[PDB]
Write a protein that binds this ligand. Structure first.
Ligand SMILES: CCCCCCCCCCCCCCCCCC(=O)OC[C@H](COP(=O)([O-])OCC[N+](C)(C)C)OC(=O)CCCCCCCCCCCCCCCCC
Ligand SMILES: CCCCCCCCCCCCCCCCCCCC(=O)O[C@H](COC(=O)CCCCCCCCCCCCCC)COP(=O)(O)OCCN
Ligand SMILES: CCCCCCCCCCCCCCCCCCCC(=O)O[C@H](COC(=O)CCCCCCCCCCCCCC)COP(=O)(O)OCCN
Ligand SMILES: COP(=O)(O)OP(=O)(O)OCC[C@H](C)CC/C=C(/C)CC/C=C(\C)CC/C=C(\C)CCC=C(C)C
Ligand SMILES: *[C@@H]1O[C@H](CO)[C@@H](O)[C@H](O)[C@H]1NC(C)=O
Lengths: 770, 56
């Protein structure tokens, strides 16, 4: 399960070449096998099956091209869900023939479509030119049918003025030009746009002016085409071009229909083709990693496998043998090993987020205490200790529930939004964070910066006027006044569940919340670190390091408990002991801890918390400092003894330096981590104050309006309040609290028992499903 | 069972299969050699038969 990584073991398979492909295909489907390169001497680009992998890559390129044409067209791509296996026999020839056809036909179709569209456009321009020239030659055509030179073409509209000016300026007053607009604008022969055009006819005298006008038009990027010289020729060639235009239109429609049909057929199965070719490529690239006939006709495979799945792998090999039809059976064999096994955690849908979260800071070593199962609660809980707010937690849990419910929809509809993909993958993390934030918001008695008062406050103001020394005169005279629980009836016990509501309206709020939350942060941090140290003991026991257990953990736990666990005990004891009547001489635990460390127990100032404090604290400090030599000197000396005096590389100086570094690191880390766990209080107070200021600066405006017209203003004011809460608080403050719970887990909690010097188990599982 | 006995049996099966492959290759090459010998012998004997028939 998730308690620690799965039992991992090497294995080696002898499998005959004929059935090897099918067997590795079954392995790929199964997904619990990780191959390893066994021919690293020769680079990947020169192995046996590189020809096969190259051809597979070419097939993948063909499929990508056809798919790109599919996207270019409006045609959609189906999705059946079948995952057929690549055909081990030489079905590659058939697939290559199919894809070669589907690519060559499409390329020929595209080229012919382009050329025929160009020809159709040119011919339609010629048709329009002929029609307008016939129209121009209709003043009085008395004759039925050579010095004058003739040309005609088409120009872009609004270029008529410049072109006419250029003609009349070059062929000075010795060329004639007539123009006519072409309604129903046409598409450019090459430029490829719908632009208005003018068909124009030019008359000129001789060869020199012919050349002049021809070059002028060519520079003006017009087009000329030939033209008739007699009305009979005009009619003949006009009819010819009209018929050719109709024929070209028919051919264009037919070829476009052919393209549409072939592309629809391609899209019907493009996904299945992609999956087939991608697995085939993966399987051949995997077989590359296996030994080749340079050593034996039967393939040799080396693999990591969990112990429990060996029988399943053998059954998969049996399927491979049956499918391949080879009489000989492939054989698997275990073998005791020295190489480091990978870390495999058997991740689940709900535990995937937390496992990735704990893996980010380093994949756990082989079979060490996995922090994931405890993280599953302590990361949401530490997040809630900071983000604690009933309303914001409600919003977050509703959002996470929406993602969870509609997860199938979003999983199917994949997008490239990295942020949204991250959040969705963490949906369960966000859901638990929202739930625990709801709980901690109830404890804080906080809901959009406002408390609830569901049980009734323990603070009654009347005893102040009844027993106390107040009156309406004092209320008039004092701007803020204050309250005291010393007089009998003011403070009627603690609030049964969560912080008392009156603190919300008390200006003394921060004075009390600061201390309560600082103590809470320190307590939770120290207990988390102690749990980590216990987990470290578990690690040592499992790995059989009694040296670590007796020097290391036990000194570490004694040091931590004596110095900082005693602080938690002091906090709880002061809470339970000191009350309002003893307020005057209530000691400060900060000063008392400083004095504990400094041996500065004074005869003046705050008194001792309890009898025997001097002696007990001196004893605790002595034990704490003794734990430093305990860690430092002992383990190196025993190691040096039993590994250099017995049996006789060990370097005593380096071992001493390493142990000194470890002891300094751990001892300074205790202090710095107990300090850094104050980020819980810091972020909680920040979130609370930001929510309070947002409320009082946004919706206080809409609420503090006498006139009933304010109900309309509250509309927009609350729109702003909602957007601001979602942006500043839910998104950014929530992200900060999330990442700081992460940092706490990675450093403060996991430095006690985690190593994270393993390798992620990357199996030969087919994820080409994408 | 994946015991040493099963591993030995599988290795023995692989050895038997490779022996069969070698034997089949040997049979094929032996048949090819026999046919080559026969055709070369026929060619040479025909070449000498030409001279014998011419003389007689
Ligand atoms: C209406 C609004 C309500 C409030 C909702 C939002 C609350 C605010 C806090 C949300 C923080 C989201 C980040 C945690 C979720 C990702 C963790 C997870 O499970 O994925 C493992 C992630 C991503 O998943 P993955 O791709 O690695 O998945 C594993 C895949 N294999 C195994 C193949 C590799 O893995 C990691 O890399 C782990 C480190 C994660 C550290 C998180 C860094 C911060 C990310 C910030 C997100 C964007 C900010 C918010 C923007 C919002 C606007 C669109
Ligand atoms: C608001 C005030 C209270 C706040 C504090 C309590 C917050 C508790 C947060 C946990 C509750 C949500 C758990 C996730 C619900 C979604 C289920 C996801 C899928 C699922 O079933 O997950 C399984 C893991 O176990 C689970 O899903 C775990 C379910 C049982 C957990 C029991 C512990 C609950 C907390 C303690 C009791 C309640 C206290 C508060 C009254 C394994 O995944 P799969 O097999 O479905 O995967 C399928 C593909 N692999
Ligand atoms: C994996 C977990 C690791 C451990 C995590 C926990 C942290 C451990 C810290 C070190 C060991 C425990 C703490 C020892 C220091 C003394 C604690 C005193 C607490 C305290 O304030 O109690 C008062 C003093 O008790 C008295 O008056 C009695 C005499 C003084 C205390 C005697 C010793 C008690 C503790 C015994 C050891 C417990 C070990 C726990 C691990 C109550 O007294 P009051 O208010 O009535 O009196 C006052 C008028 N005189
Ligand atoms: O309630 P109040 O807030 O009014 O005060 P309190 O005293 O009654 O209760 C607060 C209880 C708790 C002590 C409040 C927690 C506050 C902390 C400021 C500091 C925690 C950090 C620690 C212990 C490690 C960092 C080092 C710090 C001083 C230096 C110690 C190291 C050496 C001297 C070498
Ligand atoms: C007068 O005020 C003091 C100070 O709060 C209070 O302790 C005392 O009980 C009052 N005396 C009365 C109401 O007689």
């Amino acid at each position: 399960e998730l308690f620690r990584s799965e039992e991992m073991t090497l294995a080696q398979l002898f499998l005959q070449s004929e059935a090897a492909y099918c067997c590795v295909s079954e392995l790929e489907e199964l997904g619990k096998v990780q191959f390893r390169d066994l021919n690293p001497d020769v680079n990947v680009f020169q192995r046996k099956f590189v020809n096969e992998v190259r051809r597979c890559e070419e097939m993948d390129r063909k499929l990508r091209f056809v798919e790109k044409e599919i996207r270019k067209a409006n045609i959609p791509i189906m999705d059946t869900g079948e995952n057929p296996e690549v055909p081990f026999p030489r079905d590659m020839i058939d697939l290559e023939a199919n894809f070669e056809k589907i690519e060559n036909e499409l390329k020929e179709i595209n080229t012919n479509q382009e050329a025929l569209k160009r020809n159709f456009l040119e011919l339609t321009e010629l048709k329009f030119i002929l029609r307008k020239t016939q129209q121009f030659f209709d003043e009085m055509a008395d004759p039925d049918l050579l010095r004058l030179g003739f040309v005609a073409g088409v120009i872009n509209r609004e270029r008529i003025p410049t072109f006419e000016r250029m003609l009349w300026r070059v062929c000075r007053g010795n060329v004639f030009l007539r123009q006519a607009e072409i309604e129903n604008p046409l598409e450019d022969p090459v430029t490829g746009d719908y632009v208005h055009k003018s068909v124009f006819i030019i008359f000129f005298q001789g060869d020199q002016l012919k050349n002049r006008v021809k070059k002028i038009c060519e520079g003006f990027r017009a087009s000329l085409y030939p033209c008739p010289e007699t009305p009979q020729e005009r009619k003949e060639m006009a009819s010819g071009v009209n018929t050719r235009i109709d024929d070209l239109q028919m051919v264009l429609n037919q070829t476009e229909d052919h393209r549409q049909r072939v592309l629809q057929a391609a899209a019907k199965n493009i996904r299945v083709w992609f999956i087939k070719v991608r697995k085939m490529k993966a399987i051949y690239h995997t077989l590359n990693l296996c030994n080749i006939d340079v050593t034996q006709k039967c393939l040799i495979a080396e693999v990591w496998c969990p112990v429990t799945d060996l029988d399943s792998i053998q059954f998969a090999l049996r399927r491979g043998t049956e499918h391949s039809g080879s009489t000989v059976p492939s054989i698997l064999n275990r073998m005791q090993t020295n190489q480091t096994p990978p870390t495999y955690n058997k991740t689940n849908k709900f535990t995937h987020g937390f496992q990735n979260i704990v893996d980010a800071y380093g994949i756990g070593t082989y079979r060490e205490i996995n922090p994931a199962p405890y993280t599953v609660i302590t990361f949401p809980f530490l997040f809630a200790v900071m983000f604690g707010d009933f309303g914001h937690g409600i919003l977050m849990t509703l959002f996470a529930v929406w993602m969870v419910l509609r997860e199938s929809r979003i999983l199917s509809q994949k997008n490239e939004n990295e942020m949204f993909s991250m959040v969705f993958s963490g949906r369960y993390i966000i859901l638990l964070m929202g739930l625990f934030s709801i709980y901690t918001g109830l404890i804080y008695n906080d809901c959009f910066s406002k408390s609830l008062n569901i049980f009734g406050s323990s603070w009654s103001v009347r005893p102040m006027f009844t027993i106390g020394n107040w009156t309406e005169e004092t209320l008039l005279g004092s701007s803020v006044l204050q309250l005291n629980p010393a007089i009998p009836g003011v403070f009627g016990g603690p609030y049964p569940f969560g912080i008392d509501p009156i603190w919300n309206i008390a200006t003394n709020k921060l004075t009390f919340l600061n201390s309560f939350k600082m103590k809470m942060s320190v307590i939770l941090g120290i207990i988390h670190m102690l749990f980590g140290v216990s987990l470290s003991l578990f690690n040592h026991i499992y790995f059989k390091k009694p040296l670590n257990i007796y020097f290391g953990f036990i000194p570490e736990i004694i040091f931590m408990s004596s110095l900082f666990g005693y602080l938690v005990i002091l906090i709880f004891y002061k809470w339970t002991a000191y009350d309002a009547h003893s307020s005057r001489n209530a000691p400060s635990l900060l000063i008392h801890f400083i004095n504990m460390f400094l041996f500065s127990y004074p005869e003046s100032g705050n008194a001792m918390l309890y009898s025997g404090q001097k002696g007990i604290q001196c004893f605790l400090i002595v034990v704490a400092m003794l734990c430093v030599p305990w860690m430092l000197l002992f383990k190196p000396l025993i190691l040096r003894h039993q590994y250099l005096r017995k049996k006789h590389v060990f370097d005593f100086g380096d071992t001493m330096v390493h142990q000194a570094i470890h002891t300094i690191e751990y001892c300074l880390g205790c202090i710095s981590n107990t300090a850094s766990y104050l980020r819980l209080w810091a972020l909680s107070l920040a979130h609370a104050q930001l929510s309070e200021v947002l409320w009082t600066m946004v919706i206080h405006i809409g609420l503090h309006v006498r006139s009933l017209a304010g109900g309309l203003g509250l509309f927009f004011i609350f729109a702003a309040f909602a957007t601001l809460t979602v942006a500043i608080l839910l998104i950014m403050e929530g992200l900060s609290a999330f990442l700081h719970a992460l940092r706490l887990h990675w450093v403060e909690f996991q430095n006690k028992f985690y190593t994270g010097t393993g390798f992620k188990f990357l199996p030969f599982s087919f994820e080409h499903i994408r | 069972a994946l015991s040493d006995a099963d591993v030995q049996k599988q290795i023995k099966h692989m050895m038997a299969f490779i022996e069969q492959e070698a034997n089949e290759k040997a049979e094929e090459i032996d048949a090819k050699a026999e046919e080559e010998f026969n055709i070369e012998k026929g060619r040479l004997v025909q070449t000498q038969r030409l001279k014998i028939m011419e003389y007689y």
